[PDB]
């Protein structure tokens, strides 16, 4: 449950599925996370391509012709066409319904893990204001903001400056 | 003052998909698995053109009905029209017509 | 003078996708016929501009 504590999505973030918005002295902007986006797209295409490419069909001419005295095999033929129709229709509907659930879960899963990786590093230096956002106690410049994104953020070296504002 | 948020993409997309838990879910990006469009032509199958009999049916063509005096070395399938009436001009019974049909359908 | 790999009495179809709702009677290496009107597999995520 990360998509719809983070109510909405960003039409401002144009260059990825997942990412970040920041604000400091130097300025504010949306910044997409390519590596999580790249994987998501690479894995989801593999998913789409599995549903499609796996369908290796036999050469068939579905049509058949019978005379006025062969009504029974006619109806046997029709039973074959209609039984396969029913099987495929059902399966195709469900396959969609179920993989759609998982896709959307996956996307939720990734966001969650992104937000969790950030929260894990920052610990006490920032306040969880809800709405997916962290409000820093200390001053975090672009460089500092970068380290968090690529997960190399150094906790101790701001905490004393953050302890001042914590009280 | 200084903030950082985690978030996700949104766009102008109106595309709805269905899941097993929820119907009419609007998504950013989607594909279609269902082919719902056709070219409106009868094309060449495996590069090989069909045999189009026009106003004749197989009976008419094979016997040589006088209306059917207007064929390739091979064909991928045979095409008749719903109005195809010129078959056996002299009345009588065509023994194993349907079998000859299945047996002439690709050559 | 088009080429196809799947033929239907009212038209030819592209065999990109696994399923089709055009016609049950087909000739060739055809997509499996179904009675659905949409089969839309989500690639993106939930679109909520709040």
């Amino acid at each position: 449950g990360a998509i719809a504590f983070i109510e909405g999505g960003w039409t401002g973030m144009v260059d990825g599925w997942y990412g970040y918005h920041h604000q400091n002295e130097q300025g504010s902007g949306y910044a997409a996370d390519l590596k999580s986006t790249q994987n998501a797209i690479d894995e989801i295409t593999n998913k789409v391509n599995s549903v499609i490419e796996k369908m290796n069909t036999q050469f068939t001419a579905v049509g058949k012709e019978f005379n006025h005295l062969e009504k029974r095999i006619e109806n046997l033929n029709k039973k074959v066409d209609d039984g396969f129709l029913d099987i495929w229709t059902y399966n195709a509907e469900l396959l969609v319904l179920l993989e759609n659930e998982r896709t959307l879960d996956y996307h939720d899963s990734n966001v969650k893990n992104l937000y969790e990786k950030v929260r894990s590093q920052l610990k006490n230096n920032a306040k969880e204001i809800g709405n997916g956002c962290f409000e820093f106690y200390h001053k975090c410049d672009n460089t500092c903001m970068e380290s968090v994104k690529n997960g190399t953020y150094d906790y101790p070296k701001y905490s004393e400056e953050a302890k001042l504002n914590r009280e | 003052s200084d903030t950082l948020c985690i978030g996700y993409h949104a766009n102008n997309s109106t595309d709805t998909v269905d899941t097993v838990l929820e119907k009419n879910v609007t998504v950013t990006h989607s594909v279609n698995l269902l082919e719902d469009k056709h070219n409106g032509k009868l094309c060449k199958l495996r590069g090989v053109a069909p045999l189009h009999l026009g106003k004749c049916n197989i009976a008419g063509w094979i016997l040589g009905n006088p209306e059917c005096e207007s064929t390739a070395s091979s064909w991928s399938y045979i095409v008749e029209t719903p109005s195809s009436d010129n078959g056996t001009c002299y009345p009588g019974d065509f023994i194993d017509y349907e079998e000859l049909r299945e047996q002439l359908s690709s050559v | 003078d088009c080429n196809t790999t799947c033929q239907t009495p009212k038209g030819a179809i592209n065999t990109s996708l696994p399923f089709q709702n055009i016609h049950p009677i087909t000739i060739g290496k055809c997509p499996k016929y179904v009675k659905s009107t949409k089969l839309r597999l989500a690639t993106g995520l939930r679109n909520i501009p709040s």
Partner: antibody
Amino acid sequence: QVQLQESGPGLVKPSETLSLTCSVSGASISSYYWIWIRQPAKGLEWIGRFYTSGSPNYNPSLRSRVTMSVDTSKNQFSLKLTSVTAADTAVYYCAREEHITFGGVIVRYWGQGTLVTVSP
Amino acid sequence: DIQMTQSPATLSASVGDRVSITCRASQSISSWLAWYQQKPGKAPKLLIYKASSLESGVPSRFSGSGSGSEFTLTISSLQPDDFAIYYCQQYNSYPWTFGQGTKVEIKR
């Protein structure tokens, strides 16, 4: 469809700055990433990318001499190339970087191209 | 930072021949590669994105294949309008880099 046109001096003497501008009709300039690409009369080379909101990214082989900006009042975007040389003589294109798709991000729409000569 | 090496550099084929242009990346780039067609005195147009996705509007005689480190543009049956220089381009990483191009002339 969305139009992009390049305008600029054509001829700009050595060691000087070069300015180009890209008018966009058919779409908002606030709502997209925009890129510049050149090629000498040689192959295509990607100059960089700018967005209103907003983090630029420039090609390291040039990053020190280049600057980009957007002008929302006139729906235009601009490229500045300080301290030009012989190498900088090229045909410059502006292009729209599309919103991420399942593709994901591609240059679909380009500008007509403008020629730039570095001569005294 | 990521070198794109294209081959061949020139190519002459007749109307109807199959043409193959090959692109190689110095490191793995998965399927983040596009193909452009640049006509003379024109902006290069997009033909194929994500290695093997045919641009809407583009003829199906064009096709793309490959992932990781090797990629291929095929024109199954060449037509006179196909005279142009063809470029491959990666978008795995910044900067985006393009190939040195391949000039394709028609042999009549």
